[PDB]
Write a protein that holds these residues in place. Sequence first.
Motif, mmCIF file in Angstrom:
data_model
loop_
_atom_site.group_PDB
_atom_site.id
_atom_site.type_symbol
_atom_site.label_atom_id
_atom_site.label_comp_id
_atom_site.label_asym_id
_atom_site.label_seq_id
_atom_site.Cartn_x
_atom_site.Cartn_y
_atom_site.Cartn_z
ATOM 1 N N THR A 24 1.139 -1.101 0.055
ATOM 2 C CA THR A 24 -0.119 -0.045 0.061
ATOM 3 C C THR A 24 0.885 1.169 -0.077
ATOM 4 O OG1 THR A 24 -1.419 -1.241 1.390
ATOM 5 C CG2 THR A 24 -2.329 0.747 0.887
ATOM 6 N N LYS A 25 2.035 1.187 0.308
ATOM 7 C CA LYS A 25 2.906 2.385 0.575
ATOM 8 C C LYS A 25 3.439 2.516 -0.619
ATOM 9 C CE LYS A 25 4.819 5.799 2.665
ATOM 10 N NZ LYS A 25 3.701 6.903 3.469
ATOM 11 N N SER A 32 3.758 8.594 -6.088
ATOM 12 C CA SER A 32 3.502 10.199 -5.589
ATOM 13 C C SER A 32 4.564 10.821 -6.011
ATOM 14 C CB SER A 32 3.710 9.923 -3.892
ATOM 15 O OG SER A 32 3.693 10.995 -3.354
ATOM 16 N N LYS A 33 5.871 10.188 -6.354
ATOM 17 C CA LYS A 33 6.869 10.931 -7.002
ATOM 18 C C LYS A 33 6.388 11.337 -8.507
ATOM 19 C CE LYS A 33 11.166 9.889 -6.554
ATOM 20 N NZ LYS A 33 12.376 9.194 -6.249
ATOM 21 N N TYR A 34 5.741 10.594 -9.269
ATOM 22 C CA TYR A 34 5.005 10.948 -10.597
ATOM 23 C C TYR A 34 3.679 11.731 -10.471
ATOM 24 C CZ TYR A 34 8.210 7.951 -13.145
ATOM 25 O OH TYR A 34 9.138 7.340 -14.020
ATOM 26 N N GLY A 35 2.962 11.952 -9.556
ATOM 27 C CA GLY A 35 1.636 12.467 -9.727
ATOM 28 C C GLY A 35 1.242 13.136 -8.318
ATOM 29 N N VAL A 54 -6.130 4.224 -8.708
ATOM 30 C CA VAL A 54 -5.417 5.246 -8.034
ATOM 31 C C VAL A 54 -5.939 6.845 -8.381
ATOM 32 C CG1 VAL A 54 -3.165 6.276 -8.524
ATOM 33 C CG2 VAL A 54 -3.258 3.866 -8.432
ATOM 34 N N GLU A 55 -5.883 7.529 -7.523
ATOM 35 C CA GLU A 55 -6.368 9.037 -7.635
ATOM 36 C C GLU A 55 -5.429 10.054 -7.585
ATOM 37 O OE1 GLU A 55 -9.671 11.720 -5.700
ATOM 38 O OE2 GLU A 55 -10.124 9.635 -5.596
ATOM 39 N N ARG A 60 -3.427 15.646 -15.335
ATOM 40 C CA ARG A 60 -2.443 16.063 -16.043
ATOM 41 C C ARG A 60 -1.219 15.047 -15.739
ATOM 42 N NH1 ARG A 60 2.215 16.873 -17.596
ATOM 43 N NH2 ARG A 60 2.857 16.257 -15.152
ATOM 44 N N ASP A 61 -1.003 15.061 -14.397
ATOM 45 C CA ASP A 61 0.105 14.237 -13.703
ATOM 46 C C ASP A 61 -0.193 12.617 -13.997
ATOM 47 O OD1 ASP A 61 1.334 16.436 -13.128
ATOM 48 O OD2 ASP A 61 0.986 16.347 -10.911
ATOM 49 N N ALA A 62 -1.342 12.228 -14.031
ATOM 50 C CA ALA A 62 -1.658 10.808 -14.415
ATOM 51 C C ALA A 62 -1.009 10.544 -15.869
ATOM 52 C CB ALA A 62 -3.285 10.746 -14.200
#
Length: 84
Positions: A24-25, A32-35, A54-55, A60-62
Amino acid sequence: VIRGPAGNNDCRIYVGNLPPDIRTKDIEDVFSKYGAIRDIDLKNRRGGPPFAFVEFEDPRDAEDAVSGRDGYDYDGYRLRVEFP
RNA sequence: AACAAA
């Protein structure tokens, strides 16, 4: 419309072919580094095949996380990281 | 496409 938890935002995408050691982490570190993921929605629950949602912080970051992890050559399989 | 199992 059909959705996971109260995460009704359009910033959501789909994930599949999770590795035998998924955690989960890991979405709070790599993705999280990606978006800067806002929410996790693992669905490894019984009654069906394991998968997840995933939200993102924004749509745009997705696109950068999808282009960076989707369709990736794995041992005997291929990662799935794309929107519904 | 391991696509709501809220």
